[PDB]
Design an enzyme around this catalytic site. Sequence first.
Site, mmCIF file in Angstrom:
data_model
loop_
_atom_site.group_PDB
_atom_site.id
_atom_site.type_symbol
_atom_site.label_atom_id
_atom_site.label_comp_id
_atom_site.label_asym_id
_atom_site.label_seq_id
_atom_site.Cartn_x
_atom_site.Cartn_y
_atom_site.Cartn_z
ATOM 1 N N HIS A 173 35.959 27.957 43.485
ATOM 2 C CA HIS A 173 36.941 29.026 43.508
ATOM 3 C C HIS A 173 36.205 30.336 43.724
ATOM 4 C CE1 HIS A 173 35.488 28.887 39.362
ATOM 5 N NE2 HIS A 173 35.592 30.202 39.444
ATOM 6 N N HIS A 223 32.223 30.492 43.155
ATOM 7 C CA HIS A 223 31.701 29.622 42.113
ATOM 8 C C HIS A 223 31.925 28.165 42.461
ATOM 9 C CE1 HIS A 223 32.112 33.098 38.992
ATOM 10 N NE2 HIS A 223 31.022 33.198 39.737
ATOM 11 N N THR A 254 33.435 32.183 32.740
ATOM 12 C CA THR A 254 33.793 33.601 32.800
ATOM 13 C C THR A 254 35.285 33.836 32.595
ATOM 14 O OG1 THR A 254 34.155 33.656 35.195
ATOM 15 C CG2 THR A 254 31.887 34.058 34.399
ATOM 16 N N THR A 255 36.048 32.760 32.376
ATOM 17 C CA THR A 255 37.443 32.888 31.939
ATOM 18 C C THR A 255 37.619 32.148 30.636
ATOM 19 O OG1 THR A 255 38.323 30.891 33.012
ATOM 20 C CG2 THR A 255 38.196 32.910 34.342
ATOM 21 N N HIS A 293 45.230 32.336 38.248
ATOM 22 C CA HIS A 293 44.054 33.184 37.969
ATOM 23 C C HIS A 293 43.157 33.270 39.192
ATOM 24 C CE1 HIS A 293 45.269 32.869 33.798
ATOM 25 N NE2 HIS A 293 45.157 31.553 33.860
ATOM 26 N N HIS A 325 36.267 34.831 42.886
ATOM 27 C CA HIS A 325 36.768 36.033 42.224
ATOM 28 C C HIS A 325 36.634 37.167 43.221
ATOM 29 C CE1 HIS A 325 36.462 33.988 38.228
ATOM 30 N NE2 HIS A 325 35.513 33.338 38.878
ATOM 31 N N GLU A 343 31.611 39.034 39.852
ATOM 32 C CA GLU A 343 31.454 38.979 38.396
ATOM 33 C C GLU A 343 30.023 39.339 38.023
ATOM 34 O OE1 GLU A 343 33.491 35.162 37.217
ATOM 35 O OE2 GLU A 343 34.943 36.707 36.642
#
EC number: 4.2.1.1
Length: 257
Positions: free
Chosen positions: A91, A116, A195-196, A61, A93, A103
Amino acid sequence: HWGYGKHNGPEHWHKDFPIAKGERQSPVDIDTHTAKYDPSLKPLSVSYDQATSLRILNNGHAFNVEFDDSQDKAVLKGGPLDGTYRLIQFHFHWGSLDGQGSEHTVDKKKYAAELHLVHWNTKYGDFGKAVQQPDGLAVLGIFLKVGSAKPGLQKVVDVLDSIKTKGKSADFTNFDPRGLLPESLDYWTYPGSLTTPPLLECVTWIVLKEPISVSSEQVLKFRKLNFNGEGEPEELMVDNWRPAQPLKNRQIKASFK
Ligand SMILES: CCOc1ccc(S(N)(=O)=O)cc1
Ligand SMILES: CCOc1ccc(S(N)(=O)=O)cc1
Ligand SMILES: [Zn+2]
């Protein structure tokens, strides 16, 4: 399995994770004119001098740079937080294009990516217990825009070749996350969620106002990663972001006037 594709992306998540339509979901759009300055908010305290990175992992992911969180070595405190939160991983996004990828958004503006830094509340003993609590996590969110290179990011970029596909990991010691921070620690804060999936409502979000700059070459290397495992059909790891969710009964607070 959930993901970011046409058939398993954010619009599908609620079927297996009903909290997706909950009361404090993340990310959100940060309406800068509606956010209220809170003079009672303290300065953020970021203490990463003894941070111990261990490993970098492609989990299908995103990729996580993992830290030794078995001692108070790298901690976040102050700001909106009560107590001490331990860094466990960071990590990103990011998008398929520079025009999208973050995000959180700022007055509907999307950045090219979002970092994040994930911390868990030490009063709950470990990460697994913390995510079951409304004040279990503090995630420090940092926007990335494309421009000049971020020197402190390059060691991350250069190891991505060794973790191209889902499930691959590599030794990643002595990485100093202080090299990923902007100059200012001015922030917005609100109560939200992962958020996942599992989308647990356990996060105090602290999102920095000042983005960091990374080079086009740096973000291009993010986009060479794979969602798939080795020997499976290649699907580029891009657009691994959840879009903004309804703010509902929440106020975003600003640390700055
Ligand atoms: C493999 C069947 O396709 C799926 C599986 C899980 C989801 S989820 N977790 O987003 O709701 C969607 C499609
Ligand atoms: C077990 C999942 O752990 C997570 C999932 C999502 C996030 S994020 N994208 O909200 O910062 C952090 C830890
Ligand atoms: Zn994240």
